[PDB]
Amino acid sequence: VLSLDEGTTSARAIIFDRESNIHGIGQYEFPQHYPRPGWVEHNPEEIWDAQLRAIKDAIQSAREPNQIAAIGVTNQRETTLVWDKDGKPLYNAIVWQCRRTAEMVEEIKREYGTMIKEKTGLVPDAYFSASKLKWLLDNVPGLREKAEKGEVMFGTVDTFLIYRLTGEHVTDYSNASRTMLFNIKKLDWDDELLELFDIPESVLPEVRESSEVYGYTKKELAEIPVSGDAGDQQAALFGQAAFEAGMVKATYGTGSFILVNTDKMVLYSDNLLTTIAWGLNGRVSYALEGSIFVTGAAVQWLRDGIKIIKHASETEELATKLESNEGVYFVPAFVGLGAPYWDQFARGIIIGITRGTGREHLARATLEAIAYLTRDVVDEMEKLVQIKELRVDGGATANDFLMQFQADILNRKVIRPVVKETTALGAAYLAGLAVDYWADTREIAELWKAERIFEPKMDEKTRERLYKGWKEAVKRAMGWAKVVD
Amino acid sequence: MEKFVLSLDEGTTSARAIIFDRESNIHGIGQYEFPVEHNPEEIWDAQLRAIKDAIQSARIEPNQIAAIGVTNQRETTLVWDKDGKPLYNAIVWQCRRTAEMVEEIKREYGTMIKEKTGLVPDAYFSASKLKWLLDNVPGLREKAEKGEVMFGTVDTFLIYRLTGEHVTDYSNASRTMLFNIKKLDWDDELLELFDIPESVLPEVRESSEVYGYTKKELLGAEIPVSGDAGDQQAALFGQAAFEAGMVKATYGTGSFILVNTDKMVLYSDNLLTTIAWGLNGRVSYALEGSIFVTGAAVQWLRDGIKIIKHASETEELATKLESNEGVYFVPAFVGLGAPYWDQFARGIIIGITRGTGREHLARATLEAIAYLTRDVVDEMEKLVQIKELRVDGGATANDFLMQFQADILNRKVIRPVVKETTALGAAYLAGLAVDYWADTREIAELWKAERIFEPKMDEKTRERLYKGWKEAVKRAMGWAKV
Ligand SMILES: Nc1ncnc2c1ncn2[C@@H]1O[C@H](COP(=O)(O)OP(=O)(O)NP(=O)(O)O)[C@@H](O)[C@H]1O
Ligand SMILES: Nc1ncnc2c1ncn2[C@@H]1O[C@H](COP(=O)(O)OP(=O)(O)NP(=O)(O)O)[C@@H](O)[C@H]1O
Numbered sequence: 006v007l008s009l010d011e012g013t014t015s016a017r018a019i020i021f022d023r024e025s026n027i028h029g030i031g032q033y034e035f036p037q038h039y040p041r042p043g044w045v046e047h048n049p050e051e052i053w054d055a056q057l058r059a060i061k062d063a064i065q066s067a068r069e070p071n072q073i074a075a076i077g078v079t080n081q082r083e084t085t086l087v088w089d090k091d092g093k094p095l096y097n098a099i100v101w102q103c104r105r106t107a108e109m110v111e112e113i114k115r116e117y118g119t120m121i122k123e124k125t126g127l128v129p130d131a132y133f134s135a136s137k138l139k140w141l142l143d144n145v146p147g148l149r150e151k152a153e154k155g156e157v158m159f160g161t162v163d164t165f166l167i168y169r170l171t172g173e174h175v176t177d178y179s180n181a182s183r184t185m186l187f188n189i190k191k192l193d194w195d196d197e198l199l200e201l202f203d204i205p206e207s208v209l210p211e212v213r214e215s216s217e218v219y220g221y222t223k224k225e226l227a228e229i230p231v232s233g234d235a236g237d238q239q240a241a242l243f244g245q246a247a248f249e250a251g252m253v254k255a256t257y258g259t260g261s262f263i264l265v266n267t268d269k270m271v272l273y274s275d276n277l278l279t280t281i282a283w284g285l286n287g288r289v290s291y292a293l294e295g296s297i298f299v300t301g302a303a304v305q306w307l308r309d310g311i312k313i314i315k316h317a318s319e320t321e322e323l324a325t326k327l328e329s330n331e332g333v334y335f336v337p338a339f340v341g342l343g344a345p346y347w348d349q350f351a352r353g354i355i356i357g358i359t360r361g362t363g364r365e366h367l368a369r370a371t372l373e374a375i376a377y378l379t380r381d382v383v384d385e386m387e388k389l390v391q392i393k394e395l396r397v398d399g400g401a402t403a404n405d406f407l408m409q410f411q412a413d414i415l416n417r418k419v420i421r422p423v424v425k426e427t428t429a430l431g432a433a434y435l436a437g438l439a440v441d442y443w444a445d446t447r448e449i450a451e452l453w454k455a456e457r458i459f460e461p462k463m464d465e466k467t468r469e470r471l472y473k474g475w476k477e478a479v480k481r482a483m484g485w486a487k488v489v490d
Numbered sequence: 491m492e493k494f495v496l497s498l499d500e501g502t503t504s505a506r507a508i509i510f511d512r513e514s515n516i517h518g519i520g521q522y523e524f525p526v527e528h529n530p531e532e533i534w535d536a537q538l539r540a541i542k543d544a545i546q547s548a549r550i551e552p553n554q555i556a557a558i559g560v561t562n563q564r565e566t567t568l569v570w571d572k573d574g575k576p577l578y579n580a581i582v583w584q585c586r587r588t589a590e591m592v593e594e595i596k597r598e599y600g601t602m603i604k605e606k607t608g609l610v611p612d613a614y615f616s617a618s619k620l621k622w623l624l625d626n627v628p629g630l631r632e633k634a635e636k637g638e639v640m641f642g643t644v645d646t647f648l649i650y651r652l653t654g655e656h657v658t659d660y661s662n663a664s665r666t667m668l669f670n671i672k673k674l675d676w677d678d679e680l681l682e683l684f685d686i687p688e689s690v691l692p693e694v695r696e697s698s699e700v701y702g703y704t705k706k707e708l709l710g711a712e713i714p715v716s717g718d719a720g721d722q723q724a725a726l727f728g729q730a731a732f733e734a735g736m737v738k739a740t741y742g743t744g745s746f747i748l749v750n751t752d753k754m755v756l757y758s759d760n761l762l763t764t765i766a767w768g769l770n771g772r773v774s775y776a777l778e779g780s781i782f783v784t785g786a787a788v789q790w791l792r793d794g795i796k797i798i799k800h801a802s803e804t805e806e807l808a809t810k811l812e813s814n815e816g817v818y819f820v821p822a823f824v825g826l827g828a829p830y831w832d833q834f835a836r837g838i839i840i841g842i843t844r845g846t847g848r849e850h851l852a853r854a855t856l857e858a859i860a861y862l863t864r865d866v867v868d869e870m871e872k873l874v875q876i877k878e879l880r881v882d883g884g885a886t887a888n889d890f891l892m893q894f895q896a897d898i899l900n901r902k903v904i905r906p907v908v909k910e911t912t913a914l915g916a917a918y919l920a921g922l923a924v925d926y927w928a929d930t931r932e933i934a935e936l937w938k939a940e941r942i943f944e945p946k947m948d949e950k951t952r953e954r955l956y957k958g959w960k961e962a963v964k965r966a967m968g969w970a971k972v
Binding site: 302310311312337340352353355356358360364474477485486489490 | 783786789790794795796797816818821823824836837838839840841842843844845846847848851954957958961965966969970972
């Protein structure tokens with residue numbers, strides 16, 4: 006099985022065996038386009054070749070085409086694209102990170118805020134596709150005509166990847182829940198959101214399950230079946246065998262993303278997202294999500310902005326030089342705050358800077374920030390549902406200290422799996438099931454192995470003192486971009 | 491022979507001595523660092539070896555030194571005996587060790603203090619540090635009541651070792667917080683409150699007055715020590731800021747700003763009211779604001795987060811940008827004062843996005859130094875028109891800082907050719923007492939200006955940046971309290 010892990014920064018491809026060991030990798034980046042302050046765009050051509058060119062590294066290290074059982078696909082979510090019947094991108098993709106629609110959304114919020122959330126699960130925000138589409142049909146000349154004329158297909162990244170792969174125009178339930186046009190209850194596009202955002206039905210894909218045969222590849226390109234699809238963060242949940250209500254994973258990447266499987270129960274949170282975990286065997290599993298836009302990206306900024314480190318790994322030793330953060334906090338809201346704050350205007354703050362503050366306090370305040378952002382989500386989840394422990398993946402989870410401190414301020418176990426590329430695993434597992442490469446989810450769930458379990462060993466008083474300083478630091482990051490210009 | 495004035499610039503991190511002629515040209519320089527506390531003996535021979543360096547560099551005899559002028563880090567409290575032995579290290583002005591000892595004297599008495607002395611009570615000042623010495627230091631109070639002990643700031647010390655005299659001028663005395671600056675003698679009530687016996691207090695004279703003469707056994711001549719003021723108000727004097735409304739800012743580890751207010755005493759709730767100097771039997775008053783961390787914030791970009799090698803580097807980094815792009819840096823390392831008085835405030839950088847680089851920290855740090863000044867200059871504008879800024883200190887080398895400082899203040903910023911103005915200031919005071927210069931009018935004409943930075947910034951832009959600063963300062967408030 007071959008998994009396509011088309012991320013936000015870098016397109017992965019990976020190949021697994023029924024025991025879930027990797028037999029090939031292939032990763033390539035591609036430019037992150039910023040036409041204007043706060044705007045993030047991807048050229049779908051740069052994305053697409055980076056993807057296939059990266060399949061080949063995983064192929065060429067795996068040692069034959071039709072020896073491939075199926076293809077699974079997982080994508081950076083909400084990122085919005087458009088193309089023609091010959092498969093050509095009609096404009097750049099507007100990444101999930103892009104803020105160009107912050108205020109086209111804002112007006113619409115008040116009259117429609119609770120109706121958008123009630124149908125779709127989503128805090129309305131320029132994060133999700135619906136406003137991204139309305140821009141593309143309102144600003145790209147000829148697109149409405151061409152769509153009212155019937156020549157236009159929209160999709161999120163999975164839907165695009167599945168196209169050049171297959172010829173089919175599909176998406177799963179999980180990626181569709183992310184568009185803020187899909188009614189996660191009724192399980193179909195929601196007509197009065199198609200209205201509100203003025204989006205012609207002639208454009209939307211076909212929502213199908215997450216384990217399904219959508220179609221087969223072009224023989225040029227074996228005839229492999231494309232048989233699995235979920236949103237990037239959703240698959241991580243699958244890859245973690247989070248196949249039960251109550252189970253929680255937390256991906257640490259550019260940003261962190263924390264999901265509680267809920268399968269048949271749909272839960273509501275004012276400050277959190279209700280989306281779809283996956284559709285599987287005529288059953289739709291649900292989830293509650295907290296999406297934190299900037300975590301690991303702060304460690305990056307220590308490397309490329311002020312350049313006080315050369316490698317992200319330098320953080321652990323820089324940070325463990327101190328017994329505590331000595332009152333130094335780093336709220337790294339480079340682009341505003343994700344959940345639960347939903348402050349688009351908050352900007353990144355460092356606070357507590359005496360004459361003795363050195364690189365060590367920076368590095369520590371960054372890793373602490375990552376674990377603090379996570380606990381903000383989890384605390385908010387406990388206002389309705391019990392969170393026992395964190396299965397955990399992503400690049401930053403290499404950091405023995407981060408992982409440790411995460412568990413210490415959470416007073417819960419933090420459990421690092423033996424598998425790393427969990428997001429790909431899940432896209433494999435999904436593609437697997439539908440083409441009996443695996444019998445059941447219970448079989449899959451038994452090859453999931455716990456590589457290390459971080460035990461919380463921190464004082465309750467100490468834990469509350471540090472997180473009270475976190476909250477105060479956050480208060481001071483709020484609303485800064487409507488002050489400064 | 492042709493003669494010269496010797497200046498004694500006894501800093502806080504360095505003891506300099508410079509030799510001057512009628513044209514303020516510098517013929518010889520010696521400075522030697524010493525190692526909050528300072529050891530008298532250490533600072534003395536660090537200074538003393540720095541005299542000989544300066545005389546050697548000029549190729550001159552003790553015969554040519556027509557007068558000695560003394561400036562010094564002010565406030566710093568010292569105690570000695572009949573021949574000059576320190577009876578405990580110097581409690582330097584930076585010492586926050588009487589801090590809470592003044593907070594409980596603060597409510598009761600503070601308003602009565604500022605009325606008498608000009609000063610909002612603080613650790614900082616001289617009177618608390620010297621009661622500390624009668625209390626704590628082993629059985630000192632018992633001695634100082636026999637007449638056995640002399641007290642003074644750094645200036646009185648030097649002018650004891652040099653001279654045999656037990657003196658100080660008005661300006662240094664105005665900083666003791668024992669000197670009533672309206673009555674111009676030591677104030678009886680401030681002695682009572684802090685438990686000091688006058689058999690301890692130096693005699694206060696003008697800032698331009700032959701106090702005595704050096705021992706031949708030290709310098710080789712019996713030179714007169716004829717000028718004395720606190721190194722801040724001597725930069726003021728060295729800036730030829732002799733008329734009222736004249737202003738100088740010193741950009742160092744902190745900054746200091748003083749306005750000569752001459753024959754009238756001004757009051758401000760968030761500004762110190764002190765003495766510029768006595769001169770020709772005439773006391774001239776001044777208005778001072780202080781910032782504790784200005785250039786020390788640059789010191790931290792290199793010593794702390796270690797993102798520049800030499801402070802020099804800020805210029806090249808900051809001009810890469812043409813705005814702070816919303817990145818600000820309030821370096822409240824130890825707190826805020828004029829006009830926020832929040833000791834619990836701490837340093838913050840805000841505006842960080844994916845692309846905040848060293849350029850924005852460099853540009854934010856220079857803008858801060860510029861903004862903190864404006865804070866003090868605007869507090870003066872609540873009372874008196876501050877027309878323009880004469881400017882000295884290491885940071886004034888940063889040609890960017892200076893143009894920006896002018897830009898946000900919409901005022902000419904003036905860099906003088908002479909750069910060691912604290913030194914030059916004490917020499918004029920010495921030189922004048924010995925007809926080296928005739929009057930200040932001769933010095934005004936002699937003194938001259940190097941570069942003059944001109945405001946060229948939009949009234950719109952100038953206020954959008956500064957509102958950025960204030961809203962930034964709000965979010966540093968009260969951080970150590972919480
Ligand atoms: N040892 C470490 N300590 C701290 N942060 C780390 C460490 N290793 C990696 N990171 C951070 O983790 C990120 C890379 O994580 P990664 O698992 O590649 O997520 P990702 O590629 O952004 N997911 P995607 O959205 O699919 O592109 C960067 O922000 C790194 O700075
Ligand atoms: N070119 C520069 N640009 C910006 N900041 C500078 C520059 N040069 C020095 N600085 C900083 O500003 C101060 C330099 O002023 P300087 O007068 O050399 O300080 P100082 O020696 O502590 N003053 P003092 O003890 O009273 O004689 C230091 O704190 C430096 O960090």
